[PDB]
Subunit: 66 residues, 12 copies
């Protein structure tokens, strides 16, 4: 039966990890269809002043190809 | 002296990463004894609609065998 | 152009992942200068009673050497 | 001269590993062109009753961009 | 919500890879309950004469703890 | 705030590593927009006679989705 | 044929690496049966004063399930 | 006691994974002696038309040196 | 006898990989002493226009502590 | 609460692994303070004649920053 | 059809990465036959004065056994 | 200048890790020439009764080809 595609995206947020991945999954939902699962590959961030100003979570999203 | 066992559990939460690991550690605490440390091995999730509905954190938990 | 040094630090917090990394980055900012980016290498923790009492996030922080 | 794109797909089959990858490569062949090589990244599966009902092989497929 | 345990088992078979994992999953199903997914970690084997006499596939099996 | 996509490309050159990645980035720039960073994942090549005739560098390219 | 379970243990010793793994295998031998092979995953330790006071070797032990 | 050498071979087959490794092991058995164990390192393949025409399993074979 | 320290630095150059590492090693040579070996951990870069404007090679440098 | 720094050192000894790491930890203890834990990253060595004359164990040492 | 052997060599050069691998492939072509592909495993080097005097690229070369 | 070959051997010993590698390096020195360095890839062992009877250290040995 089924075939899936896995794209790598990195979501950003000034607020934290969960927010960063949700942004990435929201932006994927706009353009792709049948989002099933994801996997966090990596957590990074930008430092401004002496503080984190962007959390950057890169993520693999699995979705059904029809 | 002592010997430790490491078990692999994956906790689930609709709320996020810290809640998902806490759930895993709570469930381990009911059945095992002398939980000492843990390590996150992996963060994954399920997507429903175009949103994350389950954060799935898999974790290794170390505990003393007596 | 520029050369950067990457140091490995692990931040601690009784509250969670983002707080743990912020602590690490705060302490780095006191002593180093020109902090540019970071990467999370590893999330660990201590368990007291049957609950997490310390989140330990180890992180690599990149900063410009002048 | 040539530049290649690598896409990550996961093929499914109730029958086994080879069949799962063939399904993934068939579905890629429908939409893409000049498939040259593949690499198995990962073998997973779903368990129903106490038996495997889906073999899930994830695969990287390299193809020529023209 | 839910919590899963992941155990590592290595199944054996003189016939090949799918049979080896099925054996492992069968033996897990006898003793454990609510087997949900698995992941192949590793494929090894024993060589007798100049031929493979045992396929050894080590696998991670996830199951719901209730 | 922002969201990035990461695509995997492998560039080719009969001259060497830098040229191979530049080709890949050139070809990505024709079709994609807002290329921000890249990472080398892997260096391979084809041998013809007893000499390298193609350097194949596979690379991950990050770019802003708008 | 045979199906094996692999458990992860970490043995401790104030003396060194071999002693640490032997303690882990001894404690496994008390409770499990048909220990066949082991693999070292990791060597760690505790530092007291400015000296190692515990060698911590984590180890995967494979054993036959009957 | 003994000392072993591990050589890396990749076997090929138009039929599948088990056949590919058997070929590699057969060819090793012709030239080497006392083949004891193997480990799969990697599964790759060539695509011709839109179909797999070669399965290429690379494998590490351990054998006793006398 | 001798004990070594390994620091992680990332060198930059608009020209390529070797120049980037040389810059890192030059800047290490100014401040440290007895540089013995290095290892490349990682090759990254910045893209400006549709072209690489900085090669970023991160490197581990080993040097004798006396 | 607390923040730790992890430094990478490689200790040497003509005698063996434990001696090598002890030398590394001794040299760290002279200069740094509040050494808490270590992890072995890697074991290497130099061969002179047809024998090992230096054991080189590289190690990560964690210590409290105050 | 076929069977390949992979050997691991490390080529050296005072000039850089491409030269180092070419040396390794040249020396392999003298003694082996039917060199098909290679893969860079690792880039290291020796530092003399405060400068790189040898680039050491270790490489895996695949060649047809007939 | 120079070119090195890396071979993978696994040394055995009922006594421990250092002895097992020394055996591997001794057996390599009988047949090969100009052994320069080695790296430990892996520590395994056989369990007899409830005790380790063979320590199996696999090692990569680098030697000059002339
Ligand atoms: C090796 C390397 C890694 C970097 N990683 C990141 C990153 O993960 N996130 C980020 O926002 N910027 C990253 N940067 C950009 C960094 O913040 C940069 O030095 C300044 O943004 C421009 O000098 C990286 C730069 C280098 C050289
Ligand atoms: C390779 C692969 C990985 C998957 N990983 C997950 C996961 O991490 N979490 C999850 O809830 N479901 C996972 N699923 C199940 C996925 O959500 C599935 O397609 C639907 O649940 C049923 O089609 C996975 C499926 C595949 C094929
Ligand atoms: C292999 C190993 C790993 C450990 N990792 C951690 C850790 O990540 N964080 C921590 O607070 N303690 C850690 N500990 C210490 C653990 O909590 C310890 O058993 C008690 O603190 C003292 O016995 C570790 C201990 C061992 C043996
Ligand atoms: C960490 C994790 C990994 C999973 N991986 C897979 C998978 O690889 N394939 C799959 O079909 N389902 C997967 N699932 C879904 C699993 O079968 C799930 O529990 C049920 O499908 C719904 O509860 C996964 C779930 C979790 C939590
Ligand atoms: C490093 C090492 C790895 C081994 N791996 C396996 C294995 O994966 N499967 C197996 O049946 N035997 C394995 N053996 C045992 C091997 O077959 C052994 O030499 C004979 O069984 C007894 O000498 C291994 C032995 C060593 C030293
Ligand atoms: C395991 C494997 C890996 C290969 N890798 C490459 C590669 O990285 N680049 C390439 O041009 N060809 C590669 N080839 C193709 C190789 O050059 C092939 O043997 C001839 O091109 C056709 O026989 C590979 C073949 C195999 C079996
Ligand atoms: C990231 C991390 C890793 C640690 N790993 C270990 C370990 O491997 N062994 C150990 O005995 N203690 C470990 N500890 C505990 C460490 O010794 C701790 O700081 C003191 O024991 C209590 O502060 C670890 C602590 C942290 C934060
Ligand atoms: C990065 C890369 C990896 C490759 N891997 C393989 C492989 O695993 N097996 C294979 O038969 N050919 C492989 N090839 C060769 C591929 O099939 C090639 O593009 C055509 O054979 C000649 O253009 C590879 C080529 C590249 C550039
Ligand atoms: C996950 C991630 C990785 C990045 N890595 C790098 C890098 O390696 N080098 C770099 O110069 N900039 C890097 N950047 C910064 C990137 O160029 C950035 O999007 C722009 O510099 C500012 O938006 C990175 C950014 C992200 C989100
Ligand atoms: C890829 C590579 C790795 C090396 N690793 C080591 C090492 O781990 N320890 C060491 O003492 N020397 C090492 N050497 C140096 C080696 O012993 C060298 O050939 C002689 O010391 C000088 O020719 C290495 C050399 C190369 C080319
Ligand atoms: C952990 C370690 C790694 C080393 N790696 C290398 C290497 O990659 N190349 C090299 O030429 N020498 C290497 N050396 C040798 C290093 O240059 C050595 O300190 C001097 O050559 C003799 O003291 C290494 C030494 C150690 C201890
Ligand atoms: C996955 C696997 C790994 C093994 N690894 C080893 C090993 O590292 N050393 C060894 O002596 N035997 C090893 N064996 C052989 C093991 O000891 C075996 O069960 C008995 O020797 C014959 O049943 C392995 C067997 C399996 C299935
Ligand atoms: Cl990917
Ligand atoms: Cl950003
Ligand atoms: Cl996945
Ligand atoms: Cl595990
Ligand atoms: Cl769930
Ligand atoms: Cl641990
Ligand atoms: Cl802490
Ligand atoms: Cl980085
Ligand atoms: Cl499926
Ligand atoms: Cl590839
Ligand atoms: Cl378990
Ligand atoms: Cl999983
Ligand atoms: Cl090409
Ligand atoms: Cl990245
Ligand atoms: Cl302890
Ligand atoms: Cl194993
Ligand atoms: Cl830069
Ligand atoms: Cl090193
Ligand atoms: Cl590091
Ligand atoms: Cl030394
Ligand atoms: Cl650690
Ligand atoms: Cl190898
Ligand atoms: Cl050299
Ligand atoms: Cl090496």
């Amino acid at each position: 039966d089924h075939v899936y595609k896995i794209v790598e995206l990195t979501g950003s947020s000034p607020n934290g990890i969960e927010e960063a991945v949700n942004n990435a999954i929201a932006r994927a939902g706009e353009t792709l269809r049948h989002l099933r699962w994801f996997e966090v590959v990596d957590t990074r961030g930008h430092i401004e002043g002496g503080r984190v100003n962007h959390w950057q979570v890169t993520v693999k999203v699995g979705f059904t190809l029809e």
